């Protein structure tokens, strides 16, 4: 039964009822692994079962959970995850799933991971799985990028607005964008939005460049 | 008549009706000088007249305006202000004003300025005026500190809360104090207040140490 806190958070995070990711539960999962409440092995096995959920949304969401722990939980997770069998499993998985949305997300992760651990000795079964998949006829998504954990960038300072370069005065003062951490004038940071991946659910101040980029990805 | 924008801002800032400083008008005065809308000479002369206001509040407020331009407007103001006569004037001024609140504020500024320009060749008529005032029997306020302009400190990063040292997690994330720029956990920055000297009138997040220090000074 719900028993471990981890399992309740995974149920929550992979629930077909959510219309957008449940970042709060996903961030809780990352902390539980990082703090040793649950082992990388047990987490990954529970994740696999959710990957095999008959629901397309639950199945794809579990892939998002997977992307997050690989990104936020370090070597303990990387070693559990990127093995020969698992990379091959990832392969058969994406090749036989009835949901294309699921297959596309897995293809993207394989490639993201191939480039992320490109300079790492320990991992490469990933780079090859892509070789075989790119050789087997599978087409990969557009590349976007190692990766940095889900954490708000540090906040820079400066004497001019990063975007428009206007010089700050005592009246036209600086403001930080919560997504990139740079300083901007108020007119270049007049919009706001949530940054749930950084644990921020409320709408906070962001710069124009970030508001545009967030609107895309 | 109100004619120059500067004069309207000085009237506003030294108005006996204000119960707390009018930081927005004071910051406007600093920008007007910095941007050359008004010369250091004309500003200082208009300030002197307000220093000689028969109202104790207007008179003391004009001293606050003076502290601000010396602090936020650099050498153009320092040279206009710290001359032999002006330092001597400051002296006779504080010695003959009917309001003690006015005399105390001037004594504090003289000392602040003596220590602020302590390593500057150009200024010293200030250090001596204090000599004479400390030699003439006048007692000076408690020392608190050059000085840094009214501008929000840069925002540091870190992996532990600056105050309590708790380790940030994905759920117990960082927050910056708007007064000192350090990162803290939410429980060490659960209070807020305005920072009108930085041009921030609304109540913003501050750390416990700053909330205590702001409550004093
Ligand atoms: Zn700008
Ligand atoms: Zn930004
Ligand atoms: Zn703390
Ligand atoms: Zn602080």
From Swiss-Prot, chains A, B:
Binding site for Zn(2+) 2: 177, 180, 207, 210
Binding-site residues for Zn(2+) 1, renumbered to this chain: 161, 164, 185, 188
Source domain of life: Eukaryota
Zinc finger (FYVE-type): 155-215
Residue spans crossing the bilayer: none
Locations listed in the record: Cytoplasm, Cell cortex; Cytoplasm, Perinuclear region
VHS domain span: 13-141
Signal peptide positions (record): none
Oligomer status and interactors: Homodimer; in vitro. Interacts with ubiquitin.
Function: Essential role in endosome membrane invagination and formation of multivesicular bodies, MVBs. Required during gastrulation and appears to regulate early embryonic signaling pathways. Inhibits tyrosine kinase receptor signaling by promoting degradation of the tyrosine-phosphorylated, active receptor, potentially by sorting activated receptors into MVBs. The MVBs are then trafficked to the lysosome where their contents are degraded.
Descriptive protein name: Hepatocyte growth factor-regulated tyrosine kinase substrate
Native organism: Drosophila melanogaster (Fruit fly)
Covered residues, full protein: 1 to 219 of 760
């Amino acid at each position: 039964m719900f028993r471990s806190s981890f399992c309740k958070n995974l149920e929550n995070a992979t629930s077909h009822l959510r219309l957008e990711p449940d970042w709060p539960s996903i961030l809780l999962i990352c902390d539980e692994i990082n703090q040793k409440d649950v082992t990388p092995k047990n987490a990954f096995a529970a994740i696999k079962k959710k990957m095999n959920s008959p629901n397309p949304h639950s199945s794809c969401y579990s892939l998002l959970v997977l992307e997050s722990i690989v990104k936020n939980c370090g070597a303990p997770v990387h070693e559990e995850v990127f093995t020969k069998e698992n990379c091959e499993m990832f392969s058969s998985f994406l090749e036989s799933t009835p949901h294309e949305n699921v297959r596309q997300k897995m293809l993207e992760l394989v490639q993201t991971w191939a480039y992320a651990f490109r300079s790492s000795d320990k991992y490469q079964a990933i780079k090859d799985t892509m070789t075989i998949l790119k050789a087997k006829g599978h087409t990969f998504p557009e590349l976007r990028e190692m990766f940095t954990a889900d954490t708000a960038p540090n906040w820079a300072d400066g004497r001019v607005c990063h975007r428009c370069r206007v010089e700050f005065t005592f009246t036209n003062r600086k403001h930080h964008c919560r997504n990139c951490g740079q300083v901007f004038c108020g007119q270049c940071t007049a919009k706001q939005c949530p940054l749930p991946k950084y644990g921020i659910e409320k709408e906070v101040r962001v710069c124009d460049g970030c508001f545009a980029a967030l609107q895309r990805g």
